[PDB]
């Protein structure tokens, strides 16, 4: 088979394996701070430098992958806790949308919240302009921040969250498991046809944004990944 | 919410948190050995002592759970590697099935292969008698050792395996992810209405079995489980 | 190591994790009410279903635990505020003591005040019969409602109390810390060889009681416990 | 009674309630980083600005106090993970020891490892000059980094540790509970007569340190404190 795997217990802004886009910045403790606190419409993104072949136009096969990461969101005084983080998969040439308003677009969509990407957002602000549920939530996005599905969730300031994703090729079922601070788990699943919505060669990564009045600390602590494509 | 969460990195007899049914023997290194090598038809199971209420006849809700565990199956000179391990869910009153012999009921069914439980199997020996695919496989059993679905897997002697399982309360999707020694990941997923096959209170555990000519060591090295039942 | 850890921010009947002995009634708001207000000699207890092995006859070791919980005791027109709540440890086979009447056995002892258990009491009514200090107090009981040690405390109707308990495996020191509504903290500590007073397997819970003339509401709002038993 | 209490969920540089002594620095996410990864014998300390009256001259009374905090230590490449963190209590005019060598001294002792303070160290480097145990440990210090008592412990790089301390005046008992990322809890208690080892007015705080090759990320994330002195 064709297997891809990596593991980051910490980061550094000189590692060739990571692509930094936007106001991204690496802290002294090894964490990645996606957005700039005192910047209007801040947008930061981070992608694994190397492109993962998730499916073969040849065989007709699709890869299965298991990844898990942990992040932290914290409130900053006088500023609305927004907008959130999103784990995304996109074509290898993915860029921050030209003139991106930031905020509710999470840095992977245009003003009408559209774009070419599949992702799991950890939304902390309700954008009626995107059909956002009235409360914090977790969602499965498929080429739009107007989630195909969401599940109520609760963002605790300054608490480390742990996430475990699984994509089973056979069923094209993307399943998420989120371990909240109080021990409680939150799950959400959706059937997404990756071959159908993305190219053979893509890229994974994290993005986060905010507005002028909406800002908060977005930190990625660790990230491990392993994809496996059957070649037969 | 109502959440159950335990974690075992080692084991030891006498712990009130675990019930040992069968030829289960705890090694002097905190490892659980499921079957007796010197017996014909050995059978052993390890269960988490307390019944966990997976769904509520009142809420109508069904819990989601995130459980991951590791095991090892080493071969033994002049013996067919069998029958394999199995992670399962059963009615709180679950008694250990009748030991059988040439058989491979994985310790959860009768000679015919029937039984009241739902589980993920890591089978290493084919039995025309239960539709066992030609080779080693990972399956999804629902009241029968004749898996509902199966996927090609390969068991490697003396290799430690890591397994992450996720269950989505809504989508009723059971998603497994097998991480092998070399790195490659195997995954399978299936819908199983837990509220349709199991009583409100069930029990989680691992089971194994052997035959007259099929035997091997079945080691459960670690186990961590977490389930959350929304009720409101 | 061998660790037990649960967490309840709310309660609900039917949860297999908790056993209800006596006049325990679960409110429609996830709160536990220990005594019945319309009964003479009400008595109620709530216990964590599974027995926790506090010490090993093999290791000689004794587990340490960190448990914290919150409660509330509101008065009721024309009634003496009593008897108080109590956090205790008992032999796994613990039955609920005989309901008594003028009495104040806190639901863990006989008419005389004897019983097999060890606990921290939050007593709000003096009984010359058991040496109750002149006023409200927090005590450390060891097989007797006649506290081994006591410290002046003051119970305030309708106030939510936070309590953090720590037990050191070695020093055999049980240390309580009562946080009142206004802020002030009350603390008491006592050596109690858990391995000397209790059998290997015990049970943790909260108990309460009332009299003919003494009654009040006893609410257990939340509970989080964690114990670790070193074994190697 | 006289009670002192505060609570921090994140710190800031321009906060007169906190005294920053040494290589201290406050990250963008509100955490405090006690040492500088680039200096040689980097020493950092942070004290609560206002002094606390732990014992009354008039009345041979001493205060009880409850406090809990969480930290994170991480390994930095090419440097030994050292030296650790310490929660200390010192006279209100306390400073960094003249010409401190940092390292084994944890920034609160001279070269012989002596000074004026009562602390709880989370040691990560075995120094034979201070009779350190051979493994990571938690210790109780009384005017010397040569612990009056210690307990084996394990520091995990990048993991959030939660700590809870309780000091009972009546017993002059100091008990700690450390909650590892693991879920496991480590404990350690010691009887320290504060009035006998410290001045009426003290200051509480944290500290960390490193050497030439011994360096790591030391971070304080939160800190809550309450102390109540009886005055009758
Ligand atoms: O007549 S026989 O019976 O004998 C017989 C002859 C040939 C075959 C082979 C074959 N491919 C081989 C290699 C190979 C492997 C190793 C070595 S070696 O190790 O070096 O020796 C040498 C050669 C090989 C290497 C790369 C590819 N094949 C790639 C490919 C290209 C580009 C990319 S890309 O874009 O990513 O660069 C990605 C993948 C493709 N192959 C197909 C394809 C196909 C499927 C469906 C449809 S359709 O029906 O239309 O859907 C259309 C086309 C077929 C159909 C038959 C077939 N490939 C599509 C893409 C070796 C044999 C089988 C039997
Ligand atoms: O009749 S006979 O008995 O005579 C007989 C004749 C031919 C065959 C073979 C064959 N493939 C071989 C290699 C091979 C192995 C080792 C070496 S060696 O190392 O040199 O030894 C050299 C060559 C080989 C290597 C790689 C591939 N084949 C790849 C492939 C390409 C790209 C990728 S990827 O992932 O990189 O993109 C992954 C996989 C493919 N092969 C097919 C394919 C096919 C399937 C379905 C459909 S259909 O359903 O109709 O669409 C259309 C086509 C067939 C059908 C028959 C067939 N391949 C599709 C992809 C060797 C033999 C078997 C029996
Ligand atoms: O009937 S016969 O005469 O035919 C006959 C049948 C079977 C046996 C064997 C046997 N083990 C073998 C290997 C082996 C050797 C060489 C190769 S080869 O070189 O590759 O060929 C391959 C395999 C082998 C390899 C590893 C082990 N055995 C391990 C083990 C597992 C896991 C770990 S771990 O955890 O560290 O990973 C560490 C160690 C154990 N084995 C026991 C054990 C046992 C003891 C006491 C109790 S009790 O009663 O409860 O006290 C319960 C169970 C028995 C009982 C019988 C028995 N093992 C416990 C642990 C080969 C044969 C002997 C005779
Ligand atoms: O229900 S199930 O389907 O699950 C099922 C459950 C159990 C069984 C088996 C069984 N024995 C086997 C072998 C075996 C055969 C072939 C190979 S192989 O060749 O490798 O294939 C490997 C192993 C096997 C080999 C040797 C023996 N059994 C010997 C024995 C040992 C030593 C000597 S001696 O004296 O010579 O040393 C003499 C005899 C005995 N076996 C019994 C015995 C018994 C007799 C009377 C009474 S009672 O009435 O109470 O008195 C009580 C019990 C039973 C009862 C059941 C039973 N044996 C008594 C002695 C294989 C299976 C089968 C099916
Ligand atoms: O026999 S008699 O006739 O004599 C008789 C004896 C006792 C009662 C009372 C009673 N409540 C009172 C106050 C009260 C009265 C007067 C003053 S005064 O004005 O000062 O005098 C002050 C306070 C009072 C105040 C607040 C509440 N009660 C709240 C409550 C609190 C918080 C929240 S929350 O979540 O919003 O925080 C939500 C709800 C609840 N009360 C119930 C409840 C219940 C219903 C169904 C189910 S079940 O079917 O099982 O589901 C379970 C439980 C009952 C059942 C009987 C009953 N309450 C559930 C919630 C006073 C009397 C009635 C008649
Ligand atoms: O026999 S007699 O005639 O003498 C007689 C004796 C006792 C009673 C009372 C009583 N409650 C009173 C107050 C009260 C009123 C005014 C003041 S005053 O203003 O100070 O004067 C002070 C105090 C009072 C205040 C708050 C409550 N009661 C709350 C409550 C709990 C929790 C919360 S909260 O928010 O924490 O959740 C909020 C509210 C509850 N009360 C019940 C309850 C109950 C119902 C069903 C079931 S069951 O069997 O299960 O169906 C079990 C239990 C009963 C049953 C009898 C009863 N309450 C459940 C919740 C005053 C009297 C009436 C008559
Ligand atoms: O073991 S312990 O020590 O714990 C202990 C446990 C229980 C008891 C009590 C008790 N009753 C009390 C009051 C009371 C007194 C004073 C005040 S106060 O003054 O306010 O303080 C407050 C409350 C009290 C008031 C009214 C009644 N009791 C009424 C009653 C109600 C209504 C009417 S009516 O018809 O007029 O409406 C008529 C009679 C009855 N009581 C019984 C009865 C019984 C009789 C025969 C049979 S059997 O032989 O089996 O058939 C079965 C049961 C028993 C058995 C035990 C018992 N009552 C039958 C009717 C106070 C305590 C004492 C000690
Ligand atoms: O017999 S009579 O009935 O006539 C009678 C007369 C006097 C007393 C009082 C008393 N103190 C009062 C205040 C007070 C309170 C409120 C207000 S008001 O609210 O303003 O009105 C006004 C005044 C008061 C305020 C501050 C102090 N007292 C301080 C003090 C000073 C400095 C500090 S410091 O360091 O923090 O600055 C800390 C503490 C001390 N007081 C003693 C002390 C003592 C104990 C043991 C020993 S020994 O045996 O040697 O051990 C030596 C000394 C005694 C002994 C008796 C006594 N104090 C030691 C320190 C009010 C009355 C009782 C009975
Ligand atoms: O004749 S009678 O019998 O009738 C009789 C006469 C006098 C007394 C009183 C009394 N103190 C009062 C206040 C008071 C209360 C409220 C207000 S109000 O608010 O205005 O109303 C105003 C004043 C009062 C306030 C503060 C103190 N007293 C403090 C004190 C100071 C500083 C601190 S601290 O912590 O801040 O440093 C903490 C505590 C102390 N008081 C003593 C003390 C003592 C103990 C042991 C020893 S010995 O063992 O011998 O050494 C020697 C001395 C005594 C002995 C008797 C006595 N105090 C030691 C410290 C009011 C009355 C009682 C009965
Ligand atoms: O409040 C956070 C929220 O802001 C929205 O945009 C606001 C903008 O922040 C505010 O300054 C302006 O006056 O009105 C805008 C429209 O509500 C973002 O659109 C949303 O995504 C959050 O970031
Ligand atoms: O190894 C960490 C350890 O260092 C000790 O000091 C060393 C110093 O780090 C090294 O660079 C120098 O060459 O020798 C010194 C003497 O051992 C510290 O004393 C100790 O506390 C740790 O920080
Ligand atoms: Ca949003
Ligand atoms: Ca089989
Ligand atoms: Ca009492
Ligand atoms: Ca040291
Ligand atoms: Mn959304
Ligand atoms: Mn099978
Ligand atoms: Mn008492
Ligand atoms: Mn030390």
Swiss-Prot record, chains A, B, C, D:
D-galactose specific lectin. GO terms for molecular function: carbohydrate binding; metal ion binding. Mn(2+) binds at residues 121, 123, 132, 137. Ca(2+) binds at residues 123, 125, 127, 132. Keywords: Calcium, Lectin, Manganese, Metal-binding, Signal. The chain holds residues 24 to 255 of 273 of the full protein. Binds one manganese (or another transition metal) ion and one calcium ion. The metal ions are essential for the saccharide-binding and cell-agglutinating activities. Homotetramer. Belongs to the leguminous lectin family. It comes from the Eukaryota. This is Galactose-binding lectin.
């Amino acid at each position: 088979a064709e297997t891809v795997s990596f593991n980051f217990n910490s980061f550094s802004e000189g590692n060739p394996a990571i692509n930094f886009q936007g106001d991204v910045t690496v802290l002294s403790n090894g964490n990645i701070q996606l957005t700039n606190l005192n910047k209007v419409n801040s947008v930061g993104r981070v992608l694994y430098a190397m492109p993962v072949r998730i499916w073969s136009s040849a065989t007709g096969n699709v890869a299965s992958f298991l990844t898990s990461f942990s992040f932290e969101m914290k409130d900053i005084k006088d500023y609305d806790p927004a907008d959130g983080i999103i784990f995304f998969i996109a074509p290898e040439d993915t860029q921050i949308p030209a003139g991106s308003i930031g905020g509710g677009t999470l840095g992977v969509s245009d003003t009408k919240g559209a774009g070419h990407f599949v992702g799991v957002e950890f939304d902390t602000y309700s954008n009626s302009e995107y059909n956002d549920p009235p409360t914090d939530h977790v969602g499965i996005d498929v080429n739009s921040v107007d989630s195909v599905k969401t599940v109520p969730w609760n963002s605790v300031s300054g608490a480390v969250v742990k996430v475990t994703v699984i994509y089973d090729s056979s069923t094209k079922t993307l399943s998420v498991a989120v371990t909240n601070d109080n021990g409680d788990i939150t799950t959400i699943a959706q059937v997404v046809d990756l071959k159908a919505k993305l190219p053979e060669r893509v890229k994974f990564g994290f993005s986060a944004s905010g507005s002028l009045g909406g800002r908060q600390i977005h930190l990625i602590r660790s990230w491990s990944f392993t994809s496996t494509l059957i070649t037969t």
